[PDB]
């Protein structure tokens, strides 16, 4: 039947793995896919299953589980239409490109996008990934990726509604000034900042030769994690060398020019 085969396959996956969520997920969706009536459901289950077990990339492994649990939870592909066509378009990107940076951008802005169940953060996401396809500028791409994942983890992490509305002028800052051809080091500064405005703490910048310091104060430890896992994925994305200081809750950003 189609039921065990996924369940095959969910075994299969989840063995192979040493990812725990990535396991946790194949589990998920094979007893959402068990309970399932909907063959439309099963088919993308099963598409979805056996697409990771010929994937080698971890990210991709995850969003396509994500959409397995997606569909097989709700009982049809259309009640998660939105979700549906974000991860399409992140998985078009990802085999479009070439380079590794956009691949996990594409992923990763998708990932965190569909966990957070934010109607802004999911429309922010699938217009930034719209963007990038047709964008021919790989720089513009990884930046554009760049501010979507930061945005979409402000959502993932329940920053409050008028916080996350203000983060998206800074996301809307971002890709403009990358369009007038702002440097890898600005773009960073300016994922900070919507970090910061999006968790509701405090940023001076201290500017010297080719070195600017910025120092962000009232970070709780949730809150520093977050923070720092939107910046360095950015100066990841950006090729950017960021270093961090640390004192008290100061957390102090480093980026030269
Ligand atoms: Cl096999």
Not at 38 to 44: A, G, K, M, R, T
Not at 50 to 77: D, R
Not at 157 to 180: D, F, M, P
Request: charged share 35%; net charge negative.
């Amino acid at each position: 039947s189609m039921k065990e085969e996924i369940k095959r396959l969910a075994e299969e996956l989840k063995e192979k793995t040493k990812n725990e969520e990535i396991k946790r997920l194949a589990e998920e969706a094979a007893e959402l896919a068990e309970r399932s009536d909907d063959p439309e459901v099963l088919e993308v289950v099963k598409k979805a299953l056996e697409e990771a077990l010929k994937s080698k990339n971890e990210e991709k492994i995850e969003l396509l589980l994500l959409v397995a649990v997606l569909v097989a939870e709700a009982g049809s592909v259309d009640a998660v239409e939105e979700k549906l066509e974000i991860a399409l378009l992140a998985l078009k990107l990802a085999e479009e490109s070439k380079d590794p940076r956009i691949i996990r951008g594409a992923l990763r802005a998708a990932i965190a996008a569909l966990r957070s169940d934010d109607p802004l953060a999911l429309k922010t996401v699938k217009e930034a990934l719209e963007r990038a396809r047709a964008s021919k500028d790989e720089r513009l791409i990884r930046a554009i990726l760049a501010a979507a994942y930061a945005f979409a983890l402000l959502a993932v992490a329940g920053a409050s509604a008028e916080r996350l509305k203000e983060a998206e002028a800074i996301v809307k800052e971002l890709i403009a000034a990358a369009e007038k051809g702002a440097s890898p080091q600005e773009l960073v500064l300016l994922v900070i900042e919507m970090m910061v405005k999006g968790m509701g703490v405090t940023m001076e910048t201290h500017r010297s030769g080719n070195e600017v310091k910025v120092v962000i104060k009232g970070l709780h430890e949730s809150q520093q994690e977050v923070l720092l896992e939107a910046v360095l994925f950015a100066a990841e994305l950006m090729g950017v060398r960021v270093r961090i200081r640390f004192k008290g809750d100061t957390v102090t950003i480093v980026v030269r020019e």
